[PDB]
């Protein structure tokens, strides 16, 4: 499946991530959008976590939603 549009449904995950994490801002959000890697980076940027911890939270939140593609 091709990458879905970042319009409308994006407002959902923008909010969703900002509930689960929250440290990330709307600018951080738009860089992520649906990239697993980008969220990993953002977690390591906004909080300053390690890759281990960042992907730990990413995978968890991922499986909760899974609307990544």
JSON list of C-alpha atoms in Angstrom, two decimals:
[
{"chain": "A", "resi": 1, "resn": "UNK", "atom": "CA", "xyz": [0.00, 0.00, 0.00]},
{"chain": "A", "resi": 2, "resn": "UNK", "atom": "CA", "xyz": [1.24, 3.47, -0.88]},
{"chain": "A", "resi": 3, "resn": "UNK", "atom": "CA", "xyz": [1.81, 6.02, 1.87]},
{"chain": "A", "resi": 4, "resn": "UNK", "atom": "CA", "xyz": [-1.55, 7.49, 2.82]},
{"chain": "A", "resi": 5, "resn": "UNK", "atom": "CA", "xyz": [-2.24, 11.22, 2.78]},
{"chain": "A", "resi": 6, "resn": "UNK", "atom": "CA", "xyz": [-1.16, 13.42, 5.69]},
{"chain": "A", "resi": 7, "resn": "UNK", "atom": "CA", "xyz": [-4.44, 15.32, 5.61]},
{"chain": "A", "resi": 8, "resn": "UNK", "atom": "CA", "xyz": [-7.25, 14.94, 8.12]},
{"chain": "A", "resi": 9, "resn": "UNK", "atom": "CA", "xyz": [-6.10, 11.62, 9.57]},
{"chain": "A", "resi": 10, "resn": "UNK", "atom": "CA", "xyz": [-2.87, 13.40, 10.35]},
{"chain": "A", "resi": 11, "resn": "UNK", "atom": "CA", "xyz": [-4.70, 15.63, 12.83]},
{"chain": "A", "resi": 12, "resn": "UNK", "atom": "CA", "xyz": [-5.57, 12.39, 14.61]},
{"chain": "A", "resi": 13, "resn": "UNK", "atom": "CA", "xyz": [-1.96, 11.17, 14.98]},
{"chain": "A", "resi": 14, "resn": "UNK", "atom": "CA", "xyz": [-0.65, 14.63, 15.63]},
{"chain": "A", "resi": 15, "resn": "UNK", "atom": "CA", "xyz": [-2.94, 14.55, 18.63]},
{"chain": "A", "resi": 16, "resn": "UNK", "atom": "CA", "xyz": [-2.39, 10.85, 19.31]},
{"chain": "A", "resi": 17, "resn": "UNK", "atom": "CA", "xyz": [1.40, 11.18, 19.57]},
{"chain": "A", "resi": 18, "resn": "UNK", "atom": "CA", "xyz": [1.01, 14.41, 21.56]},
{"chain": "A", "resi": 19, "resn": "UNK", "atom": "CA", "xyz": [-1.06, 12.42, 24.06]},
{"chain": "A", "resi": 20, "resn": "UNK", "atom": "CA", "xyz": [1.29, 9.44, 24.32]},
{"chain": "A", "resi": 21, "resn": "UNK", "atom": "CA", "xyz": [4.49, 11.50, 24.22]},
{"chain": "A", "resi": 22, "resn": "UNK", "atom": "CA", "xyz": [3.41, 15.14, 24.32]},
{"chain": "A", "resi": 23, "resn": "UNK", "atom": "CA", "xyz": [6.89, 16.66, 24.35]},
{"chain": "A", "resi": 24, "resn": "UNK", "atom": "CA", "xyz": [6.77, 16.77, 20.56]},
{"chain": "A", "resi": 25, "resn": "UNK", "atom": "CA", "xyz": [5.38, 19.92, 19.00]},
{"chain": "A", "resi": 26, "resn": "UNK", "atom": "CA", "xyz": [3.34, 20.41, 15.82]},
{"chain": "A", "resi": 27, "resn": "UNK", "atom": "CA", "xyz": [6.58, 21.01, 13.91]},
{"chain": "A", "resi": 28, "resn": "UNK", "atom": "CA", "xyz": [8.08, 17.77, 15.21]},
{"chain": "A", "resi": 29, "resn": "UNK", "atom": "CA", "xyz": [4.89, 16.05, 14.29]},
{"chain": "A", "resi": 30, "resn": "UNK", "atom": "CA", "xyz": [4.87, 17.12, 10.64]},
{"chain": "A", "resi": 31, "resn": "UNK", "atom": "CA", "xyz": [8.43, 15.83, 10.19]},
{"chain": "A", "resi": 32, "resn": "UNK", "atom": "CA", "xyz": [7.29, 12.46, 11.55]},
{"chain": "A", "resi": 33, "resn": "UNK", "atom": "CA", "xyz": [3.83, 12.11, 9.94]},
{"chain": "A", "resi": 34, "resn": "UNK", "atom": "CA", "xyz": [4.17, 8.37, 9.50]},
{"chain": "A", "resi": 35, "resn": "UNK", "atom": "CA", "xyz": [7.87, 7.62, 9.64]},
{"chain": "A", "resi": 36, "resn": "UNK", "atom": "CA", "xyz": [8.88, 5.15, 12.33]},
{"chain": "A", "resi": 37, "resn": "UNK", "atom": "CA", "xyz": [12.47, 6.38, 12.05]},
{"chain": "A", "resi": 38, "resn": "UNK", "atom": "CA", "xyz": [11.51, 10.05, 12.39]},
{"chain": "A", "resi": 39, "resn": "UNK", "atom": "CA", "xyz": [9.59, 9.45, 15.62]},
{"chain": "A", "resi": 40, "resn": "UNK", "atom": "CA", "xyz": [12.65, 7.61, 16.96]},
{"chain": "A", "resi": 41, "resn": "UNK", "atom": "CA", "xyz": [14.72, 10.66, 16.14]},
{"chain": "A", "resi": 42, "resn": "UNK", "atom": "CA", "xyz": [12.14, 13.06, 17.57]},
{"chain": "A", "resi": 43, "resn": "UNK", "atom": "CA", "xyz": [11.97, 11.16, 20.85]},
{"chain": "A", "resi": 44, "resn": "UNK", "atom": "CA", "xyz": [15.77, 11.41, 21.01]},
{"chain": "A", "resi": 45, "resn": "UNK", "atom": "CA", "xyz": [15.53, 15.14, 20.22]},
{"chain": "A", "resi": 46, "resn": "UNK", "atom": "CA", "xyz": [12.65, 16.43, 22.32]},
{"chain": "A", "resi": 47, "resn": "UNK", "atom": "CA", "xyz": [13.28, 14.26, 25.37]},
{"chain": "A", "resi": 48, "resn": "UNK", "atom": "CA", "xyz": [16.83, 13.31, 24.62]},
{"chain": "A", "resi": 49, "resn": "UNK", "atom": "CA", "xyz": [16.32, 9.57, 24.99]},
{"chain": "A", "resi": 50, "resn": "UNK", "atom": "CA", "xyz": [18.59, 6.85, 23.68]},
{"chain": "A", "resi": 51, "resn": "UNK", "atom": "CA", "xyz": [17.83, 4.78, 20.57]},
{"chain": "A", "resi": 52, "resn": "UNK", "atom": "CA", "xyz": [16.99, 1.82, 22.82]},
{"chain": "A", "resi": 53, "resn": "UNK", "atom": "CA", "xyz": [14.39, 3.74, 24.79]},
{"chain": "A", "resi": 54, "resn": "UNK", "atom": "CA", "xyz": [13.11, 5.67, 21.78]},
{"chain": "A", "resi": 55, "resn": "UNK", "atom": "CA", "xyz": [12.30, 2.62, 19.65]},
{"chain": "A", "resi": 56, "resn": "UNK", "atom": "CA", "xyz": [10.91, 0.88, 22.72]},
{"chain": "A", "resi": 57, "resn": "UNK", "atom": "CA", "xyz": [8.25, 3.57, 22.94]},
{"chain": "A", "resi": 58, "resn": "UNK", "atom": "CA", "xyz": [7.91, 3.75, 19.15]},
{"chain": "A", "resi": 59, "resn": "UNK", "atom": "CA", "xyz": [7.19, 0.02, 18.72]},
{"chain": "A", "resi": 60, "resn": "UNK", "atom": "CA", "xyz": [4.70, 0.08, 21.61]},
{"chain": "A", "resi": 61, "resn": "UNK", "atom": "CA", "xyz": [2.77, 3.08, 20.30]},
{"chain": "A", "resi": 62, "resn": "UNK", "atom": "CA", "xyz": [3.11, 1.73, 16.76]},
{"chain": "A", "resi": 63, "resn": "UNK", "atom": "CA", "xyz": [1.31, -1.52, 17.48]},
{"chain": "A", "resi": 64, "resn": "UNK", "atom": "CA", "xyz": [-1.42, 0.44, 19.29]},
{"chain": "A", "resi": 65, "resn": "UNK", "atom": "CA", "xyz": [-2.23, 2.43, 16.14]},
{"chain": "A", "resi": 66, "resn": "UNK", "atom": "CA", "xyz": [-0.47, 0.82, 13.14]},
{"chain": "A", "resi": 67, "resn": "UNK", "atom": "CA", "xyz": [-1.82, 3.45, 10.79]},
{"chain": "A", "resi": 68, "resn": "UNK", "atom": "CA", "xyz": [1.70, 4.21, 9.63]},
{"chain": "A", "resi": 69, "resn": "UNK", "atom": "CA", "xyz": [1.37, 3.43, 5.94]}
]
